[PDB]
Amino acid sequence: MSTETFGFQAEISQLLDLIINTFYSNKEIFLRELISNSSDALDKIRYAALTDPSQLDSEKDLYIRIIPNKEEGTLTIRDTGIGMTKADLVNNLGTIAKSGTKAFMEALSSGADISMIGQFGVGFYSSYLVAEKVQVTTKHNDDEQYIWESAAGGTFTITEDTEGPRLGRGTSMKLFIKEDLKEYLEEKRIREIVKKHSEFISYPIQLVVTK
Ligand SMILES: CCNC(=O)c1noc(-c2cc(C(C)C)c(O)cc2O)c1-c1ccc(CN2CCOCC2)cc1
């Protein structure tokens, strides 16, 4: 249960400051990128299953589920993707991201839009447009379950998950929404965003509504 504290790569910290401290209007594009990242993770496990199906034993259902928690003020995006290993959390959210993170700001200096963040493979960091803190719970078939957490203060912590709920396989991403942005926890707002930005994705998008 030991927590290892790591620091963001310099370009990622530099980019993370550009997302938080700059004012943008349609911050709703974060959900498009988090669903798209969930869809890409779902693609990788079907392709792994085509090679070896024993990979779906962890969880046979492939879906994308959104769980807004108004009382906790969190938006959770759970998908049964291939998941990430402890190594992958550092090497997929870093190093591979460095070329894209730099290329994004090189495009942003050329006058690009914040919505193009997905074309540079760093669409996850757009979640900090609406989230003050992000808890990424992941589980890959060949590794253990880990909780990645960061408030974009230049440091991120990876914790081996031993007391949280089992995922089996996939990635559960808990976004701690800023108080002025609780609109992204409303039922109607989430759905009109999903239909607007993620209409044509192959996997089923699920929303947990509570009455
Ligand atoms: C290495 C094999 N495993 C995975 O790729 C994986 N499993 O779960 C992933 C999710 C990641 C995120 C954020 C933290 C990146 C989500 O919001 C949702 C996921 O399912 C997730 C993932 C999916 C896509 C990406 C970014 N891609 C896409 C753009 O190019 C770079 C790589 C990064 C991570």
Side-chain angles (χ1 to χ4, degrees), residues 123-180:
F124 155 68
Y125 302 100
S126 69
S127 56
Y128 286 97
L129 291 166
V130 303
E132 58 191 40
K133 184 174 60 174
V134 174
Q135 283 193 355
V136 170
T137 324
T138 190
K139 166 60 181 58
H140 185 269
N141 276 5
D142 302 329
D143 204 359
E144 288 288 348
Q145 183 167 309
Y146 294 87
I147 308 180
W148 179 99
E149 181 174 9
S150 175
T155 81
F156 71 73
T157 89
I158 310 208
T159 317
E160 191 179 12
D161 195 356
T162 52
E163 311 305 321
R166 295 302 88 183
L167 301 190
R169 195 201 68 257
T171 307
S172 171
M173 202 186 39
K174 199 192 258 268
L175 265 65
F176 293 84
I177 307 299
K178 306 176 177 181
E179 264 282 22
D180 252 336

Side-chain angles (χ1 to χ4, degrees), residues 34 37-38 40-41 44 79 81-84 88 92-93 96 121 124 136 138 140 170-171 173:
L34 307 174
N37 288 11
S38 311
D40 288 7
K44 286 208 166 68
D79 72 76
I82 184 179
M84 297 167 295
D88 256 305
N92 236 57
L93 288 189
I96 284 306
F124 155 68
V136 170
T138 190
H140 185 269
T171 307
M173 202 186 39

Side-chain angles (χ1 to χ4, degrees), residues 16-31:
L16 270 164
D17 177 283
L18 191 45
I19 273 77
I20 313 173
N21 292 280
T22 305
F23 150 64
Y24 315 92
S25 290
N26 62 340
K27 298 190 179 185
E28 75 201 67
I29 60 102
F30 82 103
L31 194 47

Side-chain angles (χ1 to χ4, degrees), residues 1-203:
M1 179 182 36
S2 93
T3 283
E4 275 184 333
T5 278
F6 282 127
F8 282 115
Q9 287 65 37
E11 323 82 15
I12 297 179
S13 323
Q14 180 175 356
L15 174 85
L16 270 164
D17 177 283
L18 191 45
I19 273 77
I20 313 173
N21 292 280
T22 305
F23 150 64
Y24 315 92
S25 290
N26 62 340
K27 298 190 179 185
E28 75 201 67
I29 60 102
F30 82 103
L31 194 47
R32 187 258 316 282
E33 307 295 348
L34 307 174
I35 290 179
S36 190
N37 288 11
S38 311
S39 166
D40 288 7
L42 287 179
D43 274 300
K44 286 208 166 68
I45 191 47
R46 298 179 67 247
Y47 300 151
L50 288 208
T51 303
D52 166 17
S54 84
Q55 298 282 300
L56 295 164
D57 281 4
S58 36
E59 171 106 30
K60 284 132 151 223
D61 291 308
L62 307 171
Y63 58 78
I64 293 175
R65 189 172 298 177
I66 301 167
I67 309 96
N69 192 334
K70 279 154 155 285
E71 185 166 336
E72 200 190 19
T74 68
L75 186 68
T76 306
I77 286 81
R78 154 141 190 81
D79 72 76
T80 79
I82 184 179
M84 297 167 295
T85 74
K86 172 153 193 251
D88 256 305
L89 277 160
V90 211
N91 79 58
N92 236 57
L93 288 189
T95 331
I96 284 306
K98 151 183 2 245
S99 44
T101 297
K102 187 51 221 304
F104 187 26
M105 309 193 294
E106 253 168 346
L108 267 178
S109 162
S110 293
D113 199 310
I114 190 61
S115 71
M116 291 173 52
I117 184 169
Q119 300 174 38
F120 300 89
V122 300
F124 155 68
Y125 302 100
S126 69
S127 56
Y128 286 97
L129 291 166
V130 303
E132 58 191 40
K133 184 174 60 174
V134 174
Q135 283 193 355
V136 170
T137 324
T138 190
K139 166 60 181 58
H140 185 269
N141 276 5
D142 302 329
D143 204 359
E144 288 288 348
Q145 183 167 309
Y146 294 87
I147 308 180
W148 179 99
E149 181 174 9
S150 175
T155 81
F156 71 73
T157 89
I158 310 208
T159 317
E160 191 179 12
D161 195 356
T162 52
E163 311 305 321
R166 295 302 88 183
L167 301 190
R169 195 201 68 257
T171 307
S172 171
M173 202 186 39
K174 199 192 258 268
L175 265 65
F176 293 84
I177 307 299
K178 306 176 177 181
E179 264 282 22
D180 252 336
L181 295 171
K182 295 298 173 59
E183 62 163 291
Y184 298 108
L185 304 190
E186 307 302 322
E187 174 187 348
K188 176 181 173 179
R189 187 76 177 103
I190 295 174
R191 304 177 75 166
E192 68 194 20
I193 290 169
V194 166
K195 287 176 290 179
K196 177 184 174 184
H197 292 286
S198 302
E199 191 172 37
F200 296 120
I201 87 163
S202 43
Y203 303 91

